[PDB]
Amino acid sequence: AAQTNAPWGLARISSTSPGTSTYYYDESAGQGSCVYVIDTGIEASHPEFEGRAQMVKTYYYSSRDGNGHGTHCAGTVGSRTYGVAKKTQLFGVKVLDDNGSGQYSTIIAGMDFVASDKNNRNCPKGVVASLSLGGGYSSSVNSAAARLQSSGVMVAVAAGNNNADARNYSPASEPSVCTVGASDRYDRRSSFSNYGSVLDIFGPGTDILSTWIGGSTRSISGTSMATPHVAGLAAYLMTLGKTTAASACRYIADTANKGDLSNIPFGTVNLLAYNNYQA
Protein backbone atom coordinates (compact mmCIF):
# COMPACT_ATOMS: atom_id res chain seq x y z
CA ALA A 1 0.00 0.00 0.00
CA ALA A 2 1.05 3.61 -0.60
CA GLN A 3 -0.10 6.99 0.70
CA THR A 4 1.01 9.91 -1.47
CA ASN A 5 1.45 13.37 0.06
CA ALA A 6 1.80 11.75 3.47
CA PRO A 7 3.24 13.63 6.45
CA TRP A 8 7.02 13.63 6.13
CA GLY A 9 7.34 11.43 9.21
CA LEU A 10 5.21 8.68 7.68
CA ALA A 11 7.18 8.81 4.42
CA ARG A 12 10.41 8.72 6.44
CA ILE A 13 9.34 5.50 8.19
CA SER A 14 9.25 3.63 4.87
CA SER A 15 12.12 5.39 3.06
CA THR A 16 15.91 5.26 3.16
CA SER A 17 16.48 8.97 2.46
CA PRO A 18 15.03 12.27 3.68
CA GLY A 19 12.71 14.33 1.53
CA THR A 20 10.23 11.80 0.18
CA SER A 21 6.47 12.19 0.56
CA THR A 22 4.97 8.74 -0.13
CA TYR A 23 4.47 6.29 2.75
CA TYR A 24 4.70 2.62 1.73
CA TYR A 25 3.32 -0.07 4.04
CA ASP A 26 1.80 -3.54 4.09
CA GLU A 27 -1.99 -3.59 3.70
CA SER A 28 -2.40 -5.28 7.10
CA ALA A 29 -1.73 -1.82 8.58
CA GLY A 30 -1.69 -3.04 12.17
CA GLN A 31 -5.16 -4.60 12.15
CA GLY A 32 -5.56 -6.95 15.10
CA SER A 33 -3.14 -5.05 17.34
CA CYS A 34 -3.95 -2.54 20.07
CA VAL A 35 -2.15 0.61 21.19
CA TYR A 36 -2.90 2.20 24.56
CA VAL A 37 -2.27 5.95 24.34
CA ILE A 38 -1.51 7.05 27.90
CA ASP A 39 -1.97 10.80 27.65
CA THR A 40 -4.58 13.58 27.92
CA GLY A 41 -7.23 11.35 26.32
CA ILE A 42 -8.39 10.70 22.77
CA GLU A 43 -11.17 12.47 20.87
CA ALA A 44 -12.68 9.15 19.80
CA SER A 45 -15.28 10.97 17.68
CA HIS A 46 -12.63 12.27 15.26
CA PRO A 47 -13.50 10.88 11.79
CA GLU A 48 -9.80 10.18 11.17
CA PHE A 49 -9.98 7.33 13.71
CA GLU A 50 -12.83 5.66 11.78
CA GLY A 51 -14.34 4.31 15.00
CA ARG A 52 -11.10 2.51 15.94
CA ALA A 53 -10.50 4.72 19.01
CA GLN A 54 -12.25 4.53 22.38
CA MET A 55 -11.63 5.81 25.89
CA VAL A 56 -11.20 3.00 28.42
CA LYS A 57 -9.95 4.80 31.56
CA THR A 58 -9.74 8.30 32.99
CA TYR A 59 -8.41 9.54 36.32
CA TYR A 60 -10.37 12.81 36.02
CA TYR A 61 -14.06 13.70 35.97
CA SER A 62 -14.23 13.53 32.17
CA SER A 63 -12.63 11.09 29.76
CA ARG A 64 -12.61 13.72 27.00
CA ASP A 65 -9.34 15.14 25.68
CA GLY A 66 -9.74 18.78 26.68
CA ASN A 67 -6.18 19.60 25.58
CA GLY A 68 -5.40 17.98 22.21
CA HIS A 69 -2.02 16.45 23.05
CA GLY A 70 -3.33 12.90 23.37
CA THR A 71 -5.48 13.16 20.25
CA HIS A 72 -2.44 14.32 18.27
CA CYS A 73 -0.34 11.45 19.62
CA ALA A 74 -3.04 8.86 18.91
CA GLY A 75 -3.39 10.26 15.40
CA THR A 76 0.27 9.53 14.71
CA VAL A 77 -0.19 5.95 15.95
CA GLY A 78 -3.18 4.98 13.84
CA SER A 79 -5.20 7.73 12.21
CA ARG A 80 -6.25 7.29 8.58
CA THR A 81 -4.15 10.12 7.14
CA TYR A 82 -1.50 10.72 9.82
CA GLY A 83 -0.99 7.29 11.43
CA VAL A 84 1.70 4.66 11.01
CA ALA A 85 -0.64 1.70 11.68
CA LYS A 86 -3.81 2.91 9.96
CA LYS A 87 -5.94 -0.10 11.02
CA THR A 88 -4.92 -0.64 14.65
CA GLN A 89 -7.22 -0.33 17.66
CA LEU A 90 -6.60 2.70 19.87
CA PHE A 91 -7.37 2.78 23.60
CA GLY A 92 -7.33 6.04 25.56
CA VAL A 93 -6.02 6.21 29.12
CA LYS A 94 -6.34 9.76 30.45
CA VAL A 95 -3.54 10.24 32.97
CA LEU A 96 -2.76 13.86 32.02
CA ASP A 97 -5.18 16.68 32.77
CA ASP A 98 -6.48 19.16 30.20
CA ASN A 99 -3.41 21.34 30.84
CA GLY A 100 -1.20 18.46 29.65
CA SER A 101 0.17 17.94 33.17
CA GLY A 102 0.26 14.59 34.95
CA GLN A 103 0.56 13.19 38.45
CA TYR A 104 2.82 10.55 39.97
CA SER A 105 -0.09 8.50 41.31
CA THR A 106 -2.22 8.75 38.16
CA ILE A 107 0.59 7.93 35.72
CA ILE A 108 1.68 4.92 37.79
CA ALA A 109 -1.92 3.73 38.19
CA GLY A 110 -2.45 4.18 34.46
CA MET A 111 0.31 1.73 33.58
CA ASP A 112 -1.17 -0.75 36.06
CA PHE A 113 -4.58 -0.36 34.40
CA VAL A 114 -3.27 -1.18 30.92
CA ALA A 115 -1.72 -4.45 32.09
CA SER A 116 -5.00 -5.43 33.78
CA ASP A 117 -7.30 -4.22 30.98
CA LYS A 118 -5.56 -5.82 27.99
CA ASN A 119 -6.89 -9.30 28.88
CA ASN A 120 -10.48 -8.30 28.11
CA ARG A 121 -9.61 -6.56 24.82
CA ASN A 122 -9.46 -8.11 21.35
CA CYS A 123 -5.76 -7.79 20.51
CA PRO A 124 -4.71 -11.05 18.81
CA LYS A 125 -1.66 -9.41 17.21
CA GLY A 126 -0.33 -7.88 20.44
CA VAL A 127 -0.58 -4.88 22.74
CA VAL A 128 1.42 -1.64 22.62
CA ALA A 129 1.57 1.30 25.03
CA SER A 130 2.64 4.81 23.96
CA LEU A 131 3.78 7.17 26.74
CA SER A 132 4.33 10.68 25.35
CA LEU A 133 5.14 11.98 28.81
CA GLY A 134 8.01 12.16 31.26
CA GLY A 135 9.48 13.69 34.39
CA GLY A 136 12.50 13.72 36.67
CA TYR A 137 14.24 10.51 37.60
CA SER A 138 12.11 8.19 39.72
CA SER A 139 12.81 4.54 40.49
CA SER A 140 9.09 4.14 41.20
CA VAL A 141 8.05 5.40 37.76
CA ASN A 142 10.75 3.22 36.19
CA SER A 143 9.51 0.16 38.09
CA ALA A 144 5.93 0.79 36.95
CA ALA A 145 7.04 1.04 33.32
CA ALA A 146 9.15 -2.12 33.57
CA ARG A 147 6.17 -3.94 35.10
CA LEU A 148 3.94 -2.87 32.21
CA GLN A 149 6.53 -4.19 29.75
CA SER A 150 6.81 -7.50 31.61
CA SER A 151 3.01 -7.90 31.44
CA GLY A 152 3.26 -8.43 27.67
CA VAL A 153 3.01 -4.87 26.36
CA MET A 154 5.45 -3.09 24.05
CA VAL A 155 6.05 0.15 25.97
CA ALA A 156 7.37 3.14 24.02
CA VAL A 157 8.25 6.26 26.03
CA ALA A 158 9.43 9.74 25.09
CA ALA A 159 13.05 10.66 25.78
CA GLY A 160 12.34 14.27 26.74
CA ASN A 161 12.67 17.68 25.11
CA ASN A 162 15.47 19.36 27.06
CA ASN A 163 18.50 18.52 24.85
CA ALA A 164 19.89 16.59 27.81
CA ASP A 165 20.86 13.05 28.77
CA ALA A 166 17.66 11.05 29.28
CA ARG A 167 19.32 9.08 32.09
CA ASN A 168 17.97 11.73 34.49
CA TYR A 169 14.36 11.32 33.29
CA SER A 170 11.68 8.73 34.03
CA PRO A 171 10.36 6.57 32.55
CA ALA A 172 12.86 7.47 29.81
CA SER A 173 15.72 5.97 31.85
CA GLU A 174 13.99 2.61 32.38
CA PRO A 175 16.15 0.15 30.39
CA SER A 176 13.40 -2.41 29.73
CA VAL A 177 11.17 -0.01 27.75
CA CYS A 178 11.78 1.59 24.33
CA THR A 179 13.00 5.18 24.76
CA VAL A 180 12.42 7.30 21.65
CA GLY A 181 14.26 10.41 20.49
CA ALA A 182 13.12 12.86 17.82
CA SER A 183 14.50 13.81 14.41
CA ASP A 184 13.59 16.50 11.87
CA ARG A 185 12.76 16.22 8.18
CA TYR A 186 16.42 16.80 7.23
CA ASP A 187 17.56 13.71 9.21
CA ARG A 188 19.07 15.83 11.98
CA ARG A 189 18.34 15.15 15.63
CA SER A 190 15.68 17.64 16.68
CA SER A 191 17.19 20.63 18.46
CA PHE A 192 15.19 19.85 21.61
CA SER A 193 15.50 16.06 21.61
CA ASN A 194 17.08 14.36 24.60
CA TYR A 195 19.96 11.95 23.99
CA GLY A 196 21.98 9.37 25.90
CA SER A 197 22.81 5.68 26.07
CA VAL A 198 19.29 4.90 27.35
CA LEU A 199 17.81 5.88 23.99
CA ASP A 200 16.87 2.92 21.79
CA ILE A 201 15.55 4.50 18.58
CA PHE A 202 14.79 7.83 16.91
CA GLY A 203 11.52 8.82 15.28
CA PRO A 204 10.12 11.79 13.37
CA GLY A 205 9.46 14.53 15.89
CA THR A 206 9.73 18.03 14.37
CA ASP A 207 6.69 19.59 12.65
CA ILE A 208 4.49 16.50 12.83
CA LEU A 209 1.04 16.97 11.31
CA SER A 210 -1.63 14.86 13.01
CA THR A 211 -5.16 15.03 14.40
CA TRP A 212 -6.34 17.67 16.87
CA ILE A 213 -9.44 18.10 19.00
CA GLY A 214 -12.52 19.51 17.32
CA GLY A 215 -12.14 17.16 14.36
CA SER A 216 -9.20 19.27 13.17
CA THR A 217 -5.46 18.90 12.52
CA ARG A 218 -2.31 20.53 13.85
CA SER A 219 1.46 20.34 13.38
CA ILE A 220 3.56 20.32 16.57
CA SER A 221 7.00 19.10 17.65
CA GLY A 222 8.50 17.07 20.47
CA THR A 223 9.61 13.61 21.43
CA SER A 224 5.92 13.26 22.26
CA MET A 225 5.48 13.16 18.47
CA ALA A 226 8.36 10.73 17.86
CA THR A 227 7.12 8.15 20.38
CA PRO A 228 3.79 7.35 18.60
CA HIS A 229 5.73 6.84 15.36
CA VAL A 230 7.59 4.01 17.10
CA ALA A 231 4.50 2.72 18.91
CA GLY A 232 2.63 2.59 15.61
CA LEU A 233 5.61 0.91 13.95
CA ALA A 234 5.71 -1.74 16.68
CA ALA A 235 1.99 -2.48 16.27
CA TYR A 236 2.50 -2.62 12.49
CA LEU A 237 5.42 -5.06 12.79
CA MET A 238 3.63 -7.15 15.42
CA THR A 239 0.61 -7.50 13.11
CA LEU A 240 3.03 -8.51 10.34
CA GLY A 241 4.34 -11.13 12.78
CA LYS A 242 8.02 -10.23 12.42
CA THR A 243 8.31 -9.46 16.16
CA THR A 244 6.34 -9.49 19.41
CA ALA A 245 6.04 -7.17 22.41
CA ALA A 246 9.07 -8.62 24.19
CA SER A 247 11.35 -8.38 21.13
CA ALA A 248 9.91 -5.38 19.26
CA CYS A 249 12.27 -2.69 20.58
CA ARG A 250 15.41 -4.68 19.73
CA TYR A 251 13.95 -5.75 16.38
CA ILE A 252 13.12 -2.14 15.47
CA ALA A 253 16.66 -1.13 16.43
CA ASP A 254 18.16 -4.06 14.50
CA THR A 255 16.22 -3.19 11.33
CA ALA A 256 16.47 0.61 11.64
CA ASN A 257 18.26 2.96 9.28
CA LYS A 258 21.80 3.13 10.64
CA GLY A 259 24.10 6.14 10.74
CA ASP A 260 21.91 8.45 8.64
CA LEU A 261 21.08 11.02 11.33
CA SER A 262 23.27 14.06 11.98
CA ASN A 263 24.19 15.67 15.32
CA ILE A 264 24.01 12.35 17.17
CA PRO A 265 26.54 12.60 20.03
CA PHE A 266 28.82 9.69 20.80
CA GLY A 267 27.15 7.35 23.25
CA THR A 268 23.71 7.75 21.64
CA VAL A 269 22.38 5.33 19.04
CA ASN A 270 22.22 6.56 15.45
CA LEU A 271 19.12 4.57 14.50
CA LEU A 272 15.97 5.86 12.77
CA ALA A 273 12.75 3.84 12.87
CA TYR A 274 12.24 2.01 9.58
CA ASN A 275 9.55 -0.46 8.50
CA ASN A 276 11.87 -2.25 6.01
CA TYR A 277 9.09 -2.31 3.43
CA GLN A 278 9.13 -5.64 1.57
CA ALA A 279 7.04 -5.01 -1.54
XYZ file of N, CA, C and O in Angstrom, residues 63-193:
524
model
N -13.561 11.845 30.577
C -12.629 11.086 29.757
C -12.276 11.812 28.467
O -11.455 11.311 27.693
N -12.874 12.974 28.223
C -12.609 13.717 27.002
C -11.210 14.323 27.027
O -10.668 14.655 28.086
N -10.625 14.462 25.840
C -9.344 15.141 25.680
C -9.639 16.629 25.551
O -9.967 17.120 24.468
N -9.546 17.347 26.665
C -9.738 18.779 26.677
C -8.504 19.584 26.349
O -8.526 20.812 26.481
N -7.424 18.932 25.926
C -6.176 19.598 25.578
C -5.830 19.476 24.103
O -5.607 20.488 23.432
N -5.779 18.252 23.581
C -5.398 17.984 22.211
C -4.134 17.167 22.079
O -3.920 16.540 21.035
N -3.296 17.151 23.119
C -2.019 16.448 23.055
C -2.217 14.959 22.792
O -1.570 14.379 21.912
N -3.122 14.324 23.540
C -3.333 12.896 23.372
C -3.971 12.544 22.042
O -3.668 11.501 21.456
N -4.870 13.400 21.552
C -5.477 13.163 20.246
C -4.436 13.251 19.137
O -4.450 12.451 18.193
N -3.518 14.215 19.241
C -2.436 14.323 18.268
C -1.552 13.085 18.294
O -1.186 12.548 17.242
N -1.209 12.614 19.494
C -0.341 11.450 19.623
C -1.023 10.198 19.088
O -0.403 9.402 18.371
N -2.300 10.007 19.426
C -3.044 8.861 18.915
C -3.196 8.925 17.400
O -3.212 7.884 16.733
N -3.308 10.131 16.842
C -3.388 10.256 15.396
C -2.137 9.757 14.700
O -2.210 9.149 13.631
N -0.971 9.999 15.301
C 0.275 9.529 14.708
C 0.404 8.013 14.815
O 1.028 7.383 13.952
N -0.188 7.409 15.846
C -0.187 5.952 15.947
C -1.010 5.341 14.819
O -0.502 4.556 14.011
N -2.295 5.689 14.749
C -3.175 4.983 13.838
C -4.335 5.739 13.222
O -5.385 5.143 12.965
N -4.174 7.032 12.963
C -5.201 7.729 12.207
C -5.083 7.397 10.721
O -4.051 6.920 10.240
N -6.167 7.668 9.992
C -6.251 7.287 8.585
C -5.200 8.008 7.745
O -4.520 7.390 6.917
N -5.055 9.316 7.943
C -4.148 10.122 7.136
C -2.786 10.330 7.785
O -1.789 10.487 7.073
N -2.711 10.313 9.115
C -1.500 10.716 9.822
C -0.911 9.606 10.681
O 0.038 9.862 11.433
N -1.424 8.384 10.580
C -0.993 7.290 11.427
C -0.073 6.302 10.735
O -0.148 6.099 9.525
N 0.802 5.682 11.530
C 1.699 4.657 11.007
C 0.946 3.354 10.774
O 1.076 2.723 9.718
N 0.148 2.932 11.751
C -0.639 1.700 11.677
C -2.104 2.099 11.520
O -2.842 2.211 12.500
N -2.526 2.292 10.270
C -3.811 2.908 9.956
C -5.014 2.023 10.260
O -6.144 2.485 10.076
N -4.822 0.782 10.712
C -5.945 -0.096 11.016
C -5.881 -0.674 12.425
O -6.627 -1.612 12.729
N -5.029 -0.137 13.291
C -4.922 -0.645 14.648
C -6.061 -0.117 15.516
O -6.759 0.838 15.165
N -6.242 -0.764 16.664
C -7.217 -0.332 17.656
C -6.534 0.570 18.677
O -5.468 0.229 19.200
N -7.145 1.719 18.952
C -6.596 2.704 19.874
C -7.425 2.734 21.149
O -8.658 2.768 21.091
N -6.744 2.719 22.293
C -7.374 2.784 23.605
C -6.823 3.987 24.356
O -5.603 4.140 24.478
N -7.718 4.828 24.868
C -7.328 6.045 25.556
C -7.318 5.859 27.062
O -8.304 5.412 27.652
N -6.189 6.205 27.673
C -6.025 6.208 29.123
C -5.628 7.623 29.517
O -4.499 8.056 29.253
N -6.551 8.349 30.145
C -6.341 9.761 30.454
C -5.638 9.872 31.801
O -6.278 9.850 32.856
N -4.313 9.993 31.764
C -3.536 10.235 32.972
C -3.081 11.686 33.090
O -2.689 12.111 34.188
N -3.123 12.452 32.006
C -2.762 13.860 32.020
C -4.028 14.704 31.983
O -4.992 14.363 31.290
N -4.022 15.804 32.732
C -5.182 16.683 32.769
C -5.290 17.471 31.463
O -4.519 17.279 30.517
N -6.264 18.376 31.411
C -6.477 19.161 30.204
C -5.438 20.262 30.023
O -5.429 20.917 28.976
N -4.567 20.474 31.005
C -3.407 21.337 30.838
C -2.191 20.582 30.319
O -1.129 21.189 30.143
N -2.322 19.281 30.068
C -1.200 18.465 29.652
C -0.289 18.021 30.771
O 0.761 17.426 30.497
N -0.654 18.284 32.022
C 0.168 17.941 33.173
C -0.344 16.660 33.818
O -1.552 16.412 33.861
N 0.586 15.847 34.322
C 0.262 14.588 34.947
C 0.511 14.591 36.446
O 0.850 15.599 37.062
N 0.316 13.411 37.032
C 0.562 13.186 38.446
C 1.304 11.869 38.612
O 1.168 10.957 37.791
N 2.096 11.780 39.682
C 2.823 10.546 39.967
C 1.865 9.380 40.177
O 2.044 8.301 39.602
N 0.833 9.584 41.000
C -0.089 8.497 41.311
C -0.914 8.094 40.096
O -1.161 6.905 39.873
N -1.358 9.070 39.296
C -2.218 8.747 38.159
C -1.433 8.068 37.043
O -1.934 7.136 36.404
N -0.206 8.522 36.791
C 0.587 7.927 35.720
C 0.996 6.503 36.084
O 0.973 5.601 35.238
N 1.344 6.268 37.352
C 1.682 4.917 37.790
C 0.451 4.017 37.760
O 0.518 2.868 37.306
N -0.690 4.520 38.241
C -1.918 3.732 38.192
C -2.322 3.435 36.755
O -2.834 2.350 36.456
N -2.090 4.389 35.848
C -2.454 4.183 34.456
C -1.709 3.031 33.809
O -2.281 2.281 33.015
N -0.421 2.874 34.129
C 0.311 1.734 33.584
C -0.193 0.427 34.181
O -0.227 -0.603 33.497
N -0.584 0.444 35.458
C -1.170 -0.747 36.063
C -2.505 -1.097 35.420
O -2.829 -2.282 35.272
N -3.284 -0.088 35.020
C -4.579 -0.359 34.403
C -4.419 -1.053 33.056
O -5.178 -1.975 32.735
N -3.452 -0.610 32.248
C -3.272 -1.182 30.915
C -2.955 -2.669 31.009
O -3.509 -3.486 30.263
N -2.069 -3.046 31.935
C -1.715 -4.452 32.090
C -2.906 -5.289 32.537
O -3.008 -6.466 32.175
N -3.813 -4.707 33.321
C -4.996 -5.427 33.780
C -6.134 -5.400 32.769
O -6.953 -6.326 32.747
N -6.196 -4.367 31.926
C -7.300 -4.224 30.983
C -7.095 -5.015 29.697
O -8.079 -5.398 29.053
N -5.843 -5.285 29.318
C -5.559 -5.824 27.990
C -6.147 -7.217 27.785
O -6.442 -7.600 26.646
N -6.273 -7.975 28.881
C -6.890 -9.296 28.883
C -8.227 -9.278 28.159
O -8.488 -10.094 27.268
N -9.089 -8.342 28.541
C -10.477 -8.301 28.109
C -10.659 -7.544 26.801
O -11.795 -7.245 26.421
N -9.568 -7.228 26.109
C -9.614 -6.558 24.821
C -9.247 -7.540 23.717
O -8.542 -8.527 23.950
N -9.737 -7.264 22.512
C -9.465 -8.109 21.350
C -8.197 -7.590 20.684
O -8.227 -6.669 19.866
N -7.062 -8.187 21.045
C -5.757 -7.792 20.512
C -4.961 -9.039 20.154
O -3.929 -9.337 20.766
N -5.413 -9.795 19.148
C -4.709 -11.046 18.814
C -3.289 -10.834 18.319
O -2.458 -11.741 18.455
N -2.981 -9.670 17.753
C -1.656 -9.411 17.206
C -0.709 -8.758 18.207
O 0.467 -8.565 17.886
N -1.179 -8.419 19.398
C -0.329 -7.880 20.440
C -0.801 -6.520 20.925
O -1.657 -5.868 20.331
N -0.196 -6.101 22.037
C -0.575 -4.883 22.742
C 0.632 -3.960 22.827
O 1.749 -4.403 23.112
N 0.398 -2.672 22.575
C 1.425 -1.639 22.623
C 0.933 -0.528 23.540
O -0.272 -0.280 23.652
N 1.871 0.136 24.216
C 1.567 1.305 25.031
C 2.482 2.449 24.621
O 3.702 2.272 24.534
N 1.895 3.617 24.371
C 2.635 4.806 23.965
C 2.545 5.843 25.077
O 1.444 6.265 25.449
N 3.697 6.248 25.605
C 3.779 7.169 26.737
C 4.520 8.426 26.289
O 5.737 8.536 26.454
N 3.776 9.376 25.722
C 4.331 10.678 25.345
C 4.286 11.612 26.555
O 3.583 12.622 26.595
N 5.067 11.237 27.563
C 5.140 11.983 28.810
C 6.475 11.666 29.462
O 7.216 10.790 29.013
N 6.773 12.390 30.535
C 8.006 12.159 31.258
C 8.243 13.154 32.370
O 7.639 14.231 32.398
N 9.126 12.799 33.296
C 9.478 13.685 34.387
C 10.882 13.440 34.894
O 11.672 12.764 34.230
N 11.205 13.980 36.063
C 12.495 13.723 36.672
C 12.680 12.251 36.992
O 11.753 11.443 36.952
N 13.924 11.899 37.317
C 14.243 10.507 37.599
C 13.441 10.006 38.792
O 13.333 10.683 39.819
N 12.882 8.808 38.652
C 12.105 8.192 39.722
C 12.178 6.684 39.550
O 11.717 6.156 38.535
N 12.765 5.999 40.535
C 12.809 4.541 40.487
C 11.409 3.945 40.520
O 11.183 2.861 39.969
N 10.460 4.633 41.157
C 9.087 4.140 41.200
C 8.447 4.180 39.818
O 7.811 3.211 39.389
N 8.605 5.298 39.104
C 8.052 5.402 37.756
C 8.731 4.406 36.825
O 8.085 3.806 35.958
N 10.040 4.205 36.996
C 10.748 3.219 36.185
C 10.244 1.809 36.468
O 10.074 1.007 35.541
N 9.998 1.490 37.741
C 9.509 0.159 38.087
C 8.118 -0.086 37.516
O 7.811 -1.199 37.072
N 7.265 0.941 37.514
C 5.926 0.787 36.955
C 5.982 0.561 35.451
O 5.194 -0.220 34.906
N 6.911 1.230 34.764
C 7.041 1.043 33.323
C 7.616 -0.329 32.995
O 7.179 -0.978 32.037
N 8.598 -0.783 33.776
C 9.146 -2.118 33.570
C 8.089 -3.187 33.811
O 8.047 -4.204 33.108
N 7.222 -2.971 34.803
C 6.171 -3.938 35.102
C 5.139 -4.000 33.984
O 4.610 -5.075 33.676
N 4.837 -2.859 33.364
C 3.940 -2.872 32.214
C 4.554 -3.640 31.051
O 3.866 -4.416 30.378
N 5.854 -3.450 30.810
C 6.527 -4.187 29.745
C 6.520 -5.686 30.021
O 6.270 -6.490 29.115
N 6.788 -6.083 31.269
C 6.806 -7.502 31.612
C 5.424 -8.139 31.541
O 5.329 -9.370 31.483
N 4.356 -7.339 31.546
C 3.014 -7.895 31.438
C 2.706 -8.404 30.037
O 1.734 -9.146 29.861
N 3.508 -8.031 29.043
C 3.256 -8.434 27.675
C 2.826 -7.277 26.799
O 2.036 -7.452 25.865
N 3.339 -6.084 27.095
C 3.010 -4.871 26.357
C 4.303 -4.229 25.879
O 5.245 -4.062 26.662
N 4.349 -3.874 24.597
C 5.453 -3.092 24.053
C 5.278 -1.645 24.499
O 4.380 -0.947 24.021
N 6.134 -1.194 25.411
C 6.053 0.150 25.972
C 7.046 1.042 25.239
O 8.251 0.764 25.223
N 6.541 2.112 24.635
C 7.368 3.143 24.024
C 7.177 4.436 24.802
O 6.040 4.854 25.045
N 8.285 5.057 25.206
C 8.248 6.261 26.026
C 9.077 7.351 25.361
O 10.024 7.076 24.616
N 8.708 8.600 25.632
C 9.429 9.741 25.088
C 10.715 9.985 25.868
O 10.760 9.812 27.089
N 11.762 10.400 25.153
C 13.052 10.660 25.781
C 13.100 11.985 26.530
O 13.903 12.125 27.458
N 12.275 12.948 26.156
C 12.335 14.269 26.739
C 12.790 15.312 25.729
O 13.391 15.007 24.695
N 12.510 16.572 26.054
C 12.668 17.675 25.113
C 13.543 18.774 25.694
O 13.292 19.966 25.494
N 14.602 18.392 26.407
C 15.474 19.357 27.064
C 16.908 19.315 26.553
O 17.794 19.889 27.197
N 17.154 18.665 25.413
C 18.499 18.521 24.851
C 19.490 18.098 25.934
O 20.549 18.701 26.122
N 19.117 17.055 26.671
C 19.889 16.590 27.811
C 19.901 15.069 27.814
O 19.154 14.417 27.080
N 20.764 14.503 28.652
C 20.859 13.055 28.767
C 19.606 12.512 29.444
O 19.278 12.907 30.568
N 18.911 11.600 28.764
C 17.660 11.051 29.275
C 17.854 10.124 30.466
O 16.859 9.605 30.984
N 19.094 9.899 30.910
C 19.321 9.075 32.093
C 18.682 9.691 33.331
O 18.323 8.970 34.269
N 18.529 11.015 33.351
C 17.971 11.728 34.490
C 16.474 11.972 34.350
O 15.938 12.884 34.989
N 15.791 11.176 33.529
C 14.363 11.316 33.294
C 13.696 9.954 33.408
O 14.280 8.929 33.052
N 12.463 9.951 33.909
C 11.684 8.730 34.027
C 10.316 8.932 33.390
O 9.718 10.004 33.534
N 9.783 7.914 32.692
C 10.357 6.570 32.547
C 11.376 6.423 31.417
O 11.659 5.297 31.007
N 11.921 7.540 30.925
C 12.857 7.470 29.808
C 14.102 6.661 30.159
O 14.687 6.018 29.280
N 14.513 6.668 31.425
C 15.719 5.967 31.845
C 15.483 4.499 32.181
O 16.445 3.797 32.509
N 14.250 4.019 32.111
C 13.989 2.607 32.377
C 14.555 1.767 31.238
O 14.123 1.927 30.089
N 15.513 0.874 31.501
C 16.155 0.150 30.393
C 15.227 -0.804 29.658
O 15.423 -1.026 28.456
N 14.223 -1.367 30.330
C 13.405 -2.413 29.729
C 12.360 -1.886 28.752
O 11.751 -2.691 28.041
N 12.130 -0.575 28.700
C 11.175 -0.013 27.750
C 11.930 0.542 26.551
O 13.164 0.495 26.505
N 11.198 1.064 25.570
C 11.776 1.590 24.335
C 11.736 3.114 24.401
O 10.678 3.724 24.222
N 12.892 3.725 24.657
C 13.000 5.176 24.762
C 13.267 5.775 23.386
O 14.171 5.329 22.672
N 12.488 6.793 23.024
C 12.418 7.297 21.655
C 12.873 8.751 21.624
O 12.301 9.603 22.318
N 13.890 9.040 20.797
C 14.259 10.407 20.492
C 13.598 10.908 19.212
O 12.954 10.157 18.483
N 13.776 12.202 18.942
C 13.120 12.864 17.823
C 14.134 13.338 16.788
O 15.246 13.756 17.127
N 13.728 13.282 15.518
C 14.505 13.810 14.407
C 13.636 14.766 13.597
O 12.410 14.775 13.722
N 14.285 15.575 12.760
C 13.588 16.501 11.875
C 13.617 15.973 10.441
O 14.236 14.948 10.143
N 12.932 16.694 9.546
C 12.755 16.221 8.177
C 14.065 16.150 7.402
O 14.118 15.484 6.362
N 15.117 16.815 7.880
C 16.420 16.799 7.232
C 17.348 15.744 7.824
O 18.561 15.794 7.592
N 16.797 14.796 8.583
C 17.558 13.710 9.205
C 18.584 14.231 10.207
O 19.652 13.642 10.382
N 18.271 15.334 10.877
C 19.074 15.834 11.980
C 18.293 15.625 13.268
O 17.066 15.766 13.282
N 18.994 15.251 14.337
C 18.337 15.147 15.633
C 17.683 16.477 15.972
O 18.308 17.535 15.847
N 16.411 16.424 16.365
C 15.680 17.642 16.684
C 16.423 18.437 17.748
O 17.004 17.870 18.676
N 16.419 19.764 17.585
C 17.195 20.635 18.462
C 16.877 20.397 19.930
O 17.763 20.511 20.785
N 15.631 20.042 20.238
C 15.185 19.848 21.609
C 15.385 18.428 22.119
O 15.323 18.212 23.334
N 15.613 17.462 21.231
C 15.503 16.058 21.606
C 16.572 15.666 22.619
O 17.752 15.992 22.457
